[PDB]
Design a protein around this ligand. Structure first.
Ligand code: HIS
Ligand code: HIS
Ligand code: 4JL
Ligand code: 4JL
Lengths: 411, 411
């Protein structure tokens, strides 16, 4: 007997599990459509060079990479943002900006699960925080669409610019800022030692620690000034979300930095308000990424990733993932095999009218056919019997007793 | 500058190209739903052992395989049928039969393109040709849904049982039947040699050649008898398709065997009637596969694959793939930045009502905002200006001039 289990860390989706995934993905797609985002995709296999960012990121540390027969360094994508950036860079001047692009890629890792789907939403060519506002509202919109409330979840929001200033004021060369963010993200203090290793004195580490523990934007304003970009941008951000009607979903948290090297501005992450789960989604502004890829002009970008695993756990806890049973509109039942041709003509007509319909394919008796119809969630059984067929009719039975119906009146 | 081209043999789908793929996939999904098939999925990464069939199949010869860090032989799936079989086998007794399962996996190869998407449709637990009938009708239904006619395309149909009988009558051990099919699929001089290599006398090769050139079912009946399984099954098959109303789409062709080891019964393939393209789709009955995987009871199966590349070429030729431009229902335009909060409230209301809507995110003048709206295919522009806002109104302009509308009446 062959191995029936999937490869280590990967999931099968038989139809029951696929209905759940589809429920989630319908929301991702519908939210993207509601927000005017365009779908794109790119190969799951990318060149390894795309992810060599040299900032000690967990995401690049745990890459599912391998070497092709021809000796080329490739990887199954750990994330989608680099692929997006590749595509944008390849279009160059021909791309109309602003652009709002989304996708739902499977992404990979090697170390637990080795595989997940991640809804990506990114806005390209918008300098102002209106982008982050829209992105955050999109994430909330998807969660609300799944039945969650602002009591259940929220989005923590911060700007990396506050920390940037603190690091710059201490004389720390700007090429250490990304590593500093990767490290400070690990506050989940073994962190104090890593910063020293990166090459920062205790007074600099102290100031970092203090700013991550500031509990309001006003306290940020006190320290760096109300004119500081981070303050103005965060204030605009909250004003706009408030205006859009999702004020209860969002809040300021000075300890949110994210683990990715490339965030330059606002960053955010979704969380359950019971403190039971890891982040539901995560994102930020990344204005220099395209420049590091060789773009001749800077290109503003912001976006988020929203995984398919934590959300499902949360929804299970909140009893928002009831079993969705399979459904089909009609099941056409030949009285016997001599009625199969007529039944096929009936089946054709039902499908032509936009109905989902089965025909009983195997040889079986009517009662068993009826049971089968019930099992597949048929709304209606259509019995094609010789007596009614002579009258230009079939027998119809609703499952959600027994009437004869003219062939033209079935739809 | 990073490499902007995708990895060798793989495709990018920026939004323009994604709209085309989506148009196709909508049809696959909608056809599956119309025919009552259930969606499933499985990991793109499978164990190599799953595909070691030892029949010299092109599909197993060109596997994209590699070795994990831990030393496990894995592959990116060349096809989906083995994964399906794995899943079915893992469910075992708990799976209700009949089952009709579909998916649209990306499948891979190494050698030209290294990657394609393939609509898979399979029926499990049906012994009778009604399964093949439904599968073939499904393929036709998808093609007709895309705008093709029976003048444009058809499905060639055969049974491997005819050739089975010929091989058995020559004393050829049954373990050579699959290799024989793989070889005969490669068609005159060149194929004749491979059969000899496989270990078959010229008289046996002659008889094979003759049966592949028989031009009707009647000629098959003359050779192997009218009561031969293949003849009765093919006759039932055509009677049923005729009854379903797709008789013009299907025909008998004795040279169709397919290249896969596992087909035991009826086989078929879609083709353009101009003879310009490779096969549009391909499939058949494979009643022993689950038995070879270790199933304790035989499990009848039939299905097909329908790739995403040949169909698109054909549709391009027939001018059935017009550019589908992006569309959005509304574009909300703040008169200026002081109107952004009100505009956001308007945007919220539009989206709450199920409309797709943008808001102009960066700072720009109204006419440029209008142009942008036209560029993204907005049906309607909604100008949020201070004069109208005092009256509880906005200005609306249809893009396919200028009226004031109450906020509650926008939807
Ligand atoms: N790539 C990020 C999410 C993201 C999308 N766009 C910007 N950021 C992550 O995996 O966490
Ligand atoms: N796996 C086959 C198609 C198929 C699906 N189910 C049965 N046959 C192919 O790739 O050609
Ligand atoms: O490294 C990001 C990542 C996280 C989770 C999975 Cl399963 C795959 C990738
Ligand atoms: O032979 C299977 C296969 C065929 C075509 C592509 Cl592109 C990928 C896989």
């Amino acid at each position: 007997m062959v191995e029936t289990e999937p490869v280590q860390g990967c999931r099968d989706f038989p139809p029951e599990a696929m209905r759940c995934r589809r429920h989630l993905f319908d929301v991702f797609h519908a939210t993207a459509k509601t927000f005017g985002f365009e779908e794109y995709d790119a190969p799951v296999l990318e060149s390894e060079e795309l992810y060599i960012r040299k900032a000690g990121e967990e995401i690049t540390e745990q890459m599912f990479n391998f070497i092709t027969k021809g000796g080329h360094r490739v990887a199954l994508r750990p994330e989608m943002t680099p692929s997006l950036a590749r595509l944008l860079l390849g279009k160059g001047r021909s791309l109309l900006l602003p652009a709002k692009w989304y996708s739902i890629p499977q992404c990979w890792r090697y170390e637990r699960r080795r595989e997940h789907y991640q809804w990506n939403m990114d806005i390209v060519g918008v300098k102002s925080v209106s982008a982050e506002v829209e992105l955050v509202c999109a994430a909330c919109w998807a969660m609300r669409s799944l039945g969650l409330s602002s009591k259940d979840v929220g989005i923590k929001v911060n700007s990396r610019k506050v920390l940037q200033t603190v690091v710059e004021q201490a004389g720390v060369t700007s090429d250490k800022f990304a590593p500093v963010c990767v490290i400070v993200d690990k506050m989940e203090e073994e962190v104090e030692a890593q910063l020293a290793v990166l090459g920062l004195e205790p007074t600099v580490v102290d100031a970092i620690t203090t700013t991550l523990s500031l509990k309001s934007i006003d306290e940020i304003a006190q320290r760096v000034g109300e004119e500081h970009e981070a303050v103005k941008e965060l204030r605009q951000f909250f004003e706009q979300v408030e205006a859009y009607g999702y004020g209860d979903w969002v809040l300021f948290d000075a300890s949110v930095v994210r683990g990715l090297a490339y965030y330059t501005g606002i960053v955010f992450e979704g969380f359950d308000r019971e403190g039971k789960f890891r982040a539901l989604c995560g994102g930020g502004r990344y204005d220099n990424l395209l420049t590091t890829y060789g773009s001749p002009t800077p290109i503003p970008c912001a976006g988020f990733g929203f995984g398919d695993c934590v959300i499902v756990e949360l929804l299970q806890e909140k009893r928002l993932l009831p079993d969705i049973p399979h459904v089909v509109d009609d099941v056409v039942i030949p009285f016997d095999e001599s009625m199969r041709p007529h039944a096929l003509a009936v089946l054709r007509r039902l499908r032509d009218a936009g109905r989902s319909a089965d025909i009983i394919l195997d040889k079986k008796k009517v009662v068993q056919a009826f049971n089968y119809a019930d099992r597949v969630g048929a709304v209606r059984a259509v019995l094609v019997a010789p007596e009614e067929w002579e009258r230009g009719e079939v027998q119809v039975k609703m499952l959600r007793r027994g009437f004869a119906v003219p062939l033209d009146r079935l739809v």
